[PDB]
Write a protein that binds this ligand. Structure first.
Ligand SMILES: NC(=O)c1ccc[n+]([C@@H]2O[C@H](COP(=O)([O-])OP(=O)(O)OC[C@H]3O[C@@H](n4cnc5c(N)ncnc54)[C@H](OP(=O)(O)O)[C@@H]3O)[C@@H](O)[C@H]2O)c1
Ligand SMILES: NC(=O)c1ccc[n+]([C@@H]2O[C@H](COP(=O)([O-])OP(=O)(O)OC[C@H]3O[C@@H](n4cnc5c(N)ncnc54)[C@H](OP(=O)(O)O)[C@@H]3O)[C@@H](O)[C@H]2O)c1
Ligand SMILES: NC(=O)c1ccc[n+]([C@@H]2O[C@H](COP(=O)([O-])OP(=O)(O)OC[C@H]3O[C@@H](n4cnc5c(N)ncnc54)[C@H](OP(=O)(O)O)[C@@H]3O)[C@@H](O)[C@H]2O)c1
Ligand SMILES: OC[C@H]1O[C@H](O)[C@H](O)[C@@H](O)[C@@H]1O
Ligand SMILES: OC[C@H]1O[C@H](O)[C@H](O)[C@@H](O)[C@@H]1O
Ligand SMILES: OC[C@H]1O[C@H](O)[C@H](O)[C@@H](O)[C@@H]1O
Lengths: 295, 295, 295
């Protein structure tokens, strides 16, 4: 497994394991959480991606059950968490909203640390761009969390370039990533300036839903799937390995986040690194994704 | 009333009074113009927003009738004017166009000064971005007007960030505002990079048509109006105060421009400053405005 | 004829002659190529615009037949060429794709030099923005070609501002142009930030298909054509001269590229420089092009 240094304080595995769906698994037992993590570690996948809101605010506690029952396991992994979304779940918020206040960020990180049973997270992301953001307040709160040692590095998620620029303008610490949807189903960022911006700044994006959240396999993408299967058969891997290799081929050093809860699929997650993806093949798949010839 | 320093040379009232419609009032008498201004001053609203083209090129002369008949009144107010649009009104322009030439800017400011009976305006805006702009010519003309003392400060109106960047690149003086449409009916700037750009540069926007030009009240925005009325009743103000408070809550320090010609509505214009607008309420109203949950 | 210095190493004619269609002329004889070039030179049009892919990879060899048979002719002209597109033409590429690799750029320039019978080109453009670009690799290859003397200057074509920014960030040499579609049929760049970006950087765009590739004359643009004909009759030139004068009027110093293969039309190509295009006329034509009044 390739590692990727996002800063002097943060190195991730090139492929990251996502826990959005950890609570969707009918088994949330400590042993089952440990089994998923151990299956990732066996392939050099060490980075786990979380958020405060995941699993109706239970997904970090479910991970915490695994970690708390396995001394030394947390020290083998990087934890990414997020804050900024407030989701209705009598004491529930009356409307889904964003909260990027220093107080909410601090409260979200303290709950994350208690739920996962650790004194630090590796990376904290602002989960969504906030139309009501006070960049000075949010920037100062993120810097203070890095200073405290509770957070090793900070970044953002779903930010447009102007959102990234505004928050970075109010901060000492460099924002080390933007976690954005990227896949053979979600290609707009390759042309619309969102990826160019990060590539120019030498910032690796993290790609969420790199298999479309399972939509790639739905039967709606028969031409893309036919090509992924043919390339997979040629190189002795599955269609998923080729779809992830498509992202890894980009010179912007995309960090894909896989979301499977299936231990058989976790076991082959690193096959993507075995794929040879030449420029012509990348454009074959891109052409199938955009449904027309390049201009 | 809060004041807002746009520069070392220009301080506005946080709420501005707009005179787009001053000529739509069947009464354009000096006494009636003075009554509107005095009703603004009574609430600490001191800034009046004008343009050369308003009232088929008569609105600044209508204001001038008020000022010329009331010695000392002009020295209690800030005057914002605009130039750059040439509107058909035999000697009329054959097509609506933009004119950002040094000669037209100078001619527009001299007519503004003669019509309003003053030797200076507080703020001059380029009224619309001009696809034919020569930024070097326009920039040099704006700088020269600041140097002359005829214009205390310069800004723009309806400019995209790239338009703002291009003209600022050709100027010594800082552009102190961008006057743009912002309201619960016109929310695109909060997400599309137009507001982020100004927030990053620490430039206050001026919001035009903050009640949609009256459209908010039309009966087409029943869900937004139901929420504004409920919040108004809770806090002892009208729906308009809450709609303006929604803009004032933003950390970018938006300066709303109200357009009513109704002396009863001018009298309560400052009620917006009495409203408590918490983050959850701001998102309640935003969610009603965009017609769906935030992402 | 006005000249335009793009750098200390590159001066073009203000109007450029394009050879996209040189192979569409049933006569590709050296004499006929020389006749087109001589007709351009007679009007001070010295810049010829080419690409590797033009004429199914034959257009530069067709020009080469003219040059190779006329000693001293190449030294009277500037040659613009392009690389980066790989077009299917058994050994053909299986999919249209982009190739901005150092190896492909070098191979494309060497074939261009052999086909045209010269040791240098005046300007090399990356033909299209490449979603798979490695800006560091492409930038270093472009810089190396300028250093070698094989290429006097480098620029891009069809790049968005973010594409231009990313490649320029990886290069020592300044990119001297962006060759983009601009015409009375293609006006988006005047408002969408693409032209503002280049105007702010003092980079002249080159306008391709300035007559819509002949579409202006199709009968679909009757209102625009009626106005161009009336202005042409007033000033003793044809509609084409007025349509090109419309581009030349812009303060961003647009360099139009004409594509006619008709020797009678080449002979009047410079009539565009005789047209007086005042601001009101520019907006008359712009208003016809966008199909509505300016805002
Ligand atoms: N920042 C954000 O806003 C944001 C938004 C979304 C997600 N994320 C992060 O990104 C991670 C990945 O996103 P994602 O969960 O959508 O991941 P994904 O890898 O795109 O999709 C995973 C889903 O696809 C299914 N799947 C995988 N392989 C399959 C196959 N061969 N056939 C059929 N179905 C298959 C999985 O089901 P099985 O479990 O049955 O294999 C699971 O439901 C999340 O876990 C989270 O960490 C962040
Ligand atoms: N830079 C630009 O391009 C630009 C464009 C537009 C305007 N502006 C500036 O912005 C200012 C404000 O814009 P605006 O005039 O559209 O202002 P606004 O405050 O959004 O709307 C004012 C209009 O709404 C009506 N109204 C107010 N309260 C109402 C209520 N409770 N019920 C029903 N109708 C109500 C007013 O009628 P009554 O008089 O009967 O109260 C008036 O017609 C202008 O005056 C001008 O200074 C600039
Ligand atoms: N960078 C890029 O991606 C890109 C894309 C397109 C083109 N280009 C460059 O731009 C150049 C110009 O583009 P273009 O060739 O589309 O040029 P253009 O000048 O817009 O159109 C030329 C076409 O219009 C026809 N035409 C000219 N005058 C006419 C008239 N009075 N009535 C009817 N038809 C008339 C010509 O036919 P006749 O020969 O019969 O006069 C020819 O087919 C190209 O040659 C190439 O160098 C670059
Ligand atoms: O340059 C002229 C045109 O040549 C080819 O048709 C290319 O595919 C196209 O992208 C280019 O714009
Ligand atoms: O991160 C996964 C997703 O979690 C929730 O569904 C959030 O509303 C959404 O904005 C986010 O993208
Ligand atoms: O400023 C108010 C409005 O006045 C005129 O209607 C102008 O055409 C318009 O562009 C402007 O926005």
């Amino acid at each position: 497994m390739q590692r990727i240094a996002l800063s002097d304080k943060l190195e991730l595995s090139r492929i990251v394991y996502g826990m959005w769906r950890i609570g969707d698994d009918a088994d949330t037992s400590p042993a089952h959480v440990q089994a998923k993590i151990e299956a990732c570690l066996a392939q050099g996948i060490t980075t786990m991606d979380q958020a405060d809101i995941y699993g109706g605010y239970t997904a970090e506690a479910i991970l915490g059950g695994g970690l708390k029952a396995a001394p030394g396991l947390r020290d083998k992994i990087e934890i990414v968490t997020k804050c900024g979304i407030v989701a209705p779940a009598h004491s529930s918020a009356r409307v889904k909203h964003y909260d990027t206040t220093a107080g909410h960020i601090n409260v979200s990180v303290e709950a994350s640390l208690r739920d996962m049973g650790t004194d630090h997270v590796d990376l904290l992301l602002i989960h969504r761009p906030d139309p009501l953001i006070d960049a000075e307040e949010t920037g100062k709160a993120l810097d203070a969390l890095v200073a405290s040692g509770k957070v090793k590095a900070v970044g953002v998620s779903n930010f447009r370039p102007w959102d990234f620029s505004l928050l970075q303008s109010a901060m000492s610490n460099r924002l080390v990533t933007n976690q954005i949807e990227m896949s053979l189903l979600a290609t707009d960022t390759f042309t619309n300036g969102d990826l160019a911006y990060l590539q120019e700044k030498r910032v690796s994006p993290m790609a969420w839903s790199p298999l479309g959240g399972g939509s790639l396999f739905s039967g709606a993408y028969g031409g893309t799937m036919a090509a992924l299967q043919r390339i997979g058969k040629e190189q002795g891997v599955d269609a998923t390995a080729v779809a992830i290799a498509w992202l890894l081929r980009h010179p912007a050093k995309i960090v894909p986040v896989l979301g499977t809860n299936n231990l058989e699929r976790i076991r082959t997650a690193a096959d993507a690194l075995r794929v040879t993806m030449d420029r012509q093949t990348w454009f074959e798949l891109y052409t199938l994704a955009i449904g027309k010839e390049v201009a």
